[PDB]
Amino acid sequence: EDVLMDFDALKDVGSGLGTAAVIVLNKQTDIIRAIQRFSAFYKHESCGQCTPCREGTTYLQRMMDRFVTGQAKEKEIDLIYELSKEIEGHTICALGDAAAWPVQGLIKSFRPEMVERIKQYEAKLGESVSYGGWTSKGKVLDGKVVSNPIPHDAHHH
Amino acid sequence: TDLAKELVSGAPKELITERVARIYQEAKAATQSGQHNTETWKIDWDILNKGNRWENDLMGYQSSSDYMQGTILKFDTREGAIRFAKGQGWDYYIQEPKVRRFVKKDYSANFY
Amino acid sequence: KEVELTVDGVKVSIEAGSSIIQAAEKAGVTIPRYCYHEKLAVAGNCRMCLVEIERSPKLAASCAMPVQNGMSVLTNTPKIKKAREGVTEMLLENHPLDCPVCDQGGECDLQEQSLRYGSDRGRFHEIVGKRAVENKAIGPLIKTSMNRCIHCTRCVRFLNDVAGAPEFGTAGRGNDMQIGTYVERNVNSELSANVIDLCPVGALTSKPYAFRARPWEL
Amino acid sequence: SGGPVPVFKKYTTGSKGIWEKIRQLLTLVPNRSTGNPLVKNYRVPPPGSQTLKYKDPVTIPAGDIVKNQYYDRDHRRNYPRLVAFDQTKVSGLLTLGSAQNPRISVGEKGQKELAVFDQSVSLSSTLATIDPKVVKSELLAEGGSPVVAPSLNKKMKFRLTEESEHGMYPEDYPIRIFAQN
Amino acid sequence: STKELTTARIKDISKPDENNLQQQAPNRISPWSKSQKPRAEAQDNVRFAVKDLAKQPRPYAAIDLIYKQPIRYIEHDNVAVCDGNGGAQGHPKVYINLDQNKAIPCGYCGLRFAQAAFKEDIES
Amino acid sequence: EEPLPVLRDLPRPEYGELHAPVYNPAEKYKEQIEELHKFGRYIMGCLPKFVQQFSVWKDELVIYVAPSALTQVATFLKDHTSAQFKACMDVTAADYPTRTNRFDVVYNLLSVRHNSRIRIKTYASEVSPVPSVVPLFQGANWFERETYDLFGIFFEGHPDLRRIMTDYGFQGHPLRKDFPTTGYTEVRYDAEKRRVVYEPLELTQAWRNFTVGSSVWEQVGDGKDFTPESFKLPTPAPDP
Ligand code: SF4
Ligand code: SF4
Ligand code: SF4
Ligand code: FES
Numbered sequence A: 001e002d003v004l005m006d007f008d009a010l011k012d013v014g015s016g017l018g019t020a021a022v023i024v025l026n027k028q029t030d031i032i033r034a035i036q037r038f039s040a041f042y043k044h045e046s047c048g049q050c051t052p053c054r055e056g057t058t059y060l061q062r063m064m065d066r067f068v069t070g071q072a073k074e075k076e077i078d079l080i081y082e083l084s085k086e087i088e089g090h091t092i093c094a095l096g097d098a099a100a101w102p103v104q105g106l107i108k109s110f111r112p113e114m115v116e117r118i119k120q121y122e123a124k125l126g127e128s129v130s131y132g133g134w135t136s137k138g139k140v141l142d143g144k145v146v147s148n149p150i151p152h153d154a155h156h157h
Numbered sequence B: 001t002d003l004a005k006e007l008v009s010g011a012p013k014e015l016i017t018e019r020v021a022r023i024y025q026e027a028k029a030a031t032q033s034g035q036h037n038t039e040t041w042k043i044d045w046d047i048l049n050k051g052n053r054w055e056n057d058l059m060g061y062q063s064s065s066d067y068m069q070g071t072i073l074k075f076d077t078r079e080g081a082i083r084f085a086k087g088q089g090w091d092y093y094i095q096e097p098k099v100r101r102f103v104k105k106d107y108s109a110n111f112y
Numbered sequence C: 001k002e003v004e005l006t007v008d009g010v011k012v013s014i015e016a017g018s019s020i021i022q023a024a025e026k027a028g029v030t031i032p033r034y035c036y037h038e039k040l041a042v043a044g045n046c047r048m049c050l051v052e053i054e055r056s057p058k059l060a061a062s063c064a065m066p067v068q069n070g071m072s073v074l075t076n077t078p079k080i081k082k083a084r085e086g087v088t089e090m091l092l093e094n095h096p097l098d099c100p101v102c103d104q105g106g107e108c109d110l111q112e113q114s115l116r117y118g119s120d121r122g123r124f125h126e127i128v129g130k131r132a133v134e135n136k137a138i139g140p141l142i143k144t145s146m147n148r149c150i151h152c153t154r155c156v157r158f159l160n161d162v163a164g165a166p167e168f169g170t171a172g173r174g175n176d177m178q179i180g181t182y183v184e185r186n187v188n189s190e191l192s193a194n195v196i197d198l199c200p201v202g203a204l205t206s207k208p209y210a211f212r213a214r215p216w217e218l
Numbered sequence D: 001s002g003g004p005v006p007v008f009k010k011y012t013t014g015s016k017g018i019w020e021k022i023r024q025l026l027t028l029v030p031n032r033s034t035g036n037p038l039v040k041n042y043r044v045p046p047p048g049s050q051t052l053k054y055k056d057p058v059t060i061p062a063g064d065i066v067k068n069q070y071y072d073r074d075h076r077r078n079y080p081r082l083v084a085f086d087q088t089k090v091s092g093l094l095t096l097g098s099a100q101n102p103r104i105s106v107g108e109k110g111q112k113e114l115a116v117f118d119q120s121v122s123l124s125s126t127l128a129t130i131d132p133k134v135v136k137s138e139l140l141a142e143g144g145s146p147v148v149a150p151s152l153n154k155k156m157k158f159r160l161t162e163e164s165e166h167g168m169y170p171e172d173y174p175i176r177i178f179a180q181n
Numbered sequence E: 001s002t003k004e005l006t007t008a009r010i011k012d013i014s015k016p017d018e019n020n021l022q023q024q025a026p027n028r029i030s031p032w033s034k035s036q037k038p039r040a041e042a043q044d045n046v047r048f049a050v051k052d053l054a055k056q057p058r059p060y061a062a063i064d065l066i067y068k069q070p071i072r073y074i075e076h077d078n079v080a081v082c083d084g085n086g087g088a089q090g091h092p093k094v095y096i097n098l099d100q101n102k103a104i105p106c107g108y109c110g111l112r113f114a115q116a117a118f119k120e121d122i123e124s
Numbered sequence F: 001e002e003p004l005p006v007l008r009d010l011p012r013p014e015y016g017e018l019h020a021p022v023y024n025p026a027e028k029y030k031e032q033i034e035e036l037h038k039f040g041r042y043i044m045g046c047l048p049k050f051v052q053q054f055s056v057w058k059d060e061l062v063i064y065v066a067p068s069a070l071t072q073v074a075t076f077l078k079d080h081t082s083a084q085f086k087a088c089m090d091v092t093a094a095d096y097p098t099r100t101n102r103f104d105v106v107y108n109l110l111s112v113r114h115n116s117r118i119r120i121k122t123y124a125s126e127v128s129p130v131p132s133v134v135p136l137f138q139g140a141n142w143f144e145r146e147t148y149d150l151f152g153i154f155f156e157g158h159p160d161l162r163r164i165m166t167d168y169g170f171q172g173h174p175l176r177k178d179f180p181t182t183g184y185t186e187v188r189y190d191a192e193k194r195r196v197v198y199e200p201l202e203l204t205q206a207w208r209n210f211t212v213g214s215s216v217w218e219q220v221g222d223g224k225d226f227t228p229e230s231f232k233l234p235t236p237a238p239d240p
């Protein structure tokens, strides 16, 4: 409402004027999938030498894919926030900091949307999903996960 | 210290006449990078030229007649080990640990 | 030349140009590390040696940051111990549950440092699973189980610099980075097997010694 | 309380019918159980044929995925350090006071005084030459009173009960039952 | 013979016989380790002079049994997950990578996993 | 005469997620730490000639005295009304060969009076005698008899010192660190001599020392400071 394009005025509200690629959206879209796509971008583009971003960027990716379908638990929403804090400040180059800020952006301002997504999936599936996505009956048979929604959201390809 | 304290310990005479003890400080292991097992001095006894270990015929065990095979002593100062060895009248020999030579290591050296 | 500094209240006198970790190791303070070896070039990628310096917000890789004069170095702040458990929680995200069948069992630095500096619980129940790699065959002396590599590049730095065998390197990018020789060829150096001692985890183990003993027996 | 209980209120096998009336007519204390457990109640679902699906119990602060940093609850490494008080440190505390009740000058003048007790100071001399109020205030207690050995349990008290309350042996038997109070 | 009975082989040569007491196991003739003592030499001992060798313990050799299982084939995924088919009563869960054109056995169970697309070459 | 309930079927409480506070177990001893510190100092002030130093750990107060200061400090702690330790519970030792006097003789006294326990530590070497507390505490007759049997400590003033645990004519004191855990000899029944005879030790399976595979990293930190704020020397504050 009073956003003024500055290197620091946008910083006060938590964002920043990095590359001035100002993006404007509408309410007829799911930001959970839009942020999930950034997470799958920083993962695929991280060089992969520092431990926090070689692995932690995969930790985010493996969790936003369960978020976008709502196959998670409500407390796991703030679990991934604690993950993003374990990455920042520990990497050599600023790509690690750039992979955690979008995760906080979803949580900071759009928290109720993730809860509604999970509450949908409880109703949609019918059976609540435990930590990590495991249903009550999900197990391993002859070398494959069975009786559980496997999220083939790793670009398939 | 100066006394022949071994005459009161009741230990068999063979530890004075027939066995050799060693005062050493355990070396750093190549596999692991920890440096804590190499800060206490230890005493161990040499093995026997025969009868240290032999295969039990029945079950293939490791029989032994060496009653000092599983005896390792711990100390915190080198002198205490030597003094204790002197007190018992042990025929010991000291193994001086190697000292790693300092070399400064710089991140920038990969290009300079 | 020497610059006098204090690490956690212990005065340190070292040669100038040295790194913080050597200064700390001289003062007796133990700084956990995976990627730092005292006979190899310094890489700063494992991010386990992080410390806090008084005039900075940014944690310092003590294996790479050279020493200063009058600098105050902290190693036991709650901020640091939070960082050490975060990094530990990342290395074990993709590490296999191989300790019973792993020849590094009783002598693995990833076990003892995780026990000492990491948390006692894991928070990874993900349903997709861990990362899996194919084992590369690099001769009859080195038995590779690359699932266990923590991407610390001690093998690469040793073979390139000390051994002079430039056929070993990092091929790939990010989550698919795969230490090896890219194509299938055996490592050719008379000192190639010293990599077995440097590899802190069970990724590179002895082939003749495979499965024969545990380190507490010997 | 531990009052006598009717026999049919105990989980043991008991007679029925005509033999119950015979049992009550001939026994000294009719409410004494035979001691043979009830076949239909005792261990009836054996330990290997239960129905309870056990779940690992986890209190939240120490079992949570969040707000559960290990260094917060790492008590094994927060053990109390071992400090031994020699005669010298007792003298230094006695002469200079404590950290809570300072009796030391400030700045370099104080740093002179602390360094005095940084090397050997026998306590025999210190008590010979110091204000008698110091002993009554620091060493002794309550204006010169001695220091009684501290109690491991400040709530350990006892009181005498009687058979109408403790139910045990009456007053003639040569033992007495002590309560808490 | 005593040539197969005293040397370990990956696969035997002749068909094993359950009644032959000199075999290493009732379902396998030759030993399955380089340091495993042959059963023929083990029972050629004084302590067996007046025994009944048919009643000594002869468990079935587990190497021969495990290779009688079919190969699991995974569909449109190069990573197999194995846990011993018992969950909390099996081995720890280990992920197997099937990029190489072969059947990679599980570290604990010994079950062999491969890809479906590779079956034809594997079954040659 | 109602039928007995089937306790299997009666309803059980339902709980959600359990909460238990996490707090340092060493905190609850805080009051005990100060009072032992005060009473520890009191003994030192009363007897500066004997009490070398005193130490407090949680709820245990230790008094360190020389062998020549034992009978004096023991008598004081037995007879002084402020500290009536009439009951001596344990007399033992420990072997630290690195120190000049290896043996460390420890006494535990119980005050049923004030509900307190105190510990006396006094050192000893292999040949230097230690005063016997049997004239004060009769319960130390066998605890001193046991310490000599397992540590060889000379106890001066003991009415009857002899082996109590080991066999008669047993050579060597077992709990000394230099004594191997399996000893030196073993017994068997010899047919020729019609009697049980001693022979030198020979194990069919030699003891396996798995203790070598101990931790190569230090496992517990430097600890935490729990001294009462009334027992630290004040820092001389900086000047203007
Ligand atoms: S933080 Fe940067 S340098 Fe480090 S692994 Fe990630 S992309 Fe590479
Ligand atoms: S390398 Fe260490 S942590 Fe990894 S499986 Fe082997 S023993 Fe376990
Ligand atoms: S294979 Fe071993 S030495 Fe090489 S980078 Fe991985 S963990 Fe380090
Ligand atoms: S030891 Fe410094 S980052 Fe690896």
Ligand SMILES: [K+]
Residues within 6 Å of the ligand: C104, C196, C197, C198, C199, C200, C201, C202, C203, C204, C205
């Ligand atoms: K290794």
Ligand SMILES: [Zn+2]
Residues within 6 Å of the ligand: E082, E083, E084, E091, E106, E107, E108, E109, E110, E111
């Ligand atoms: Zn398996």
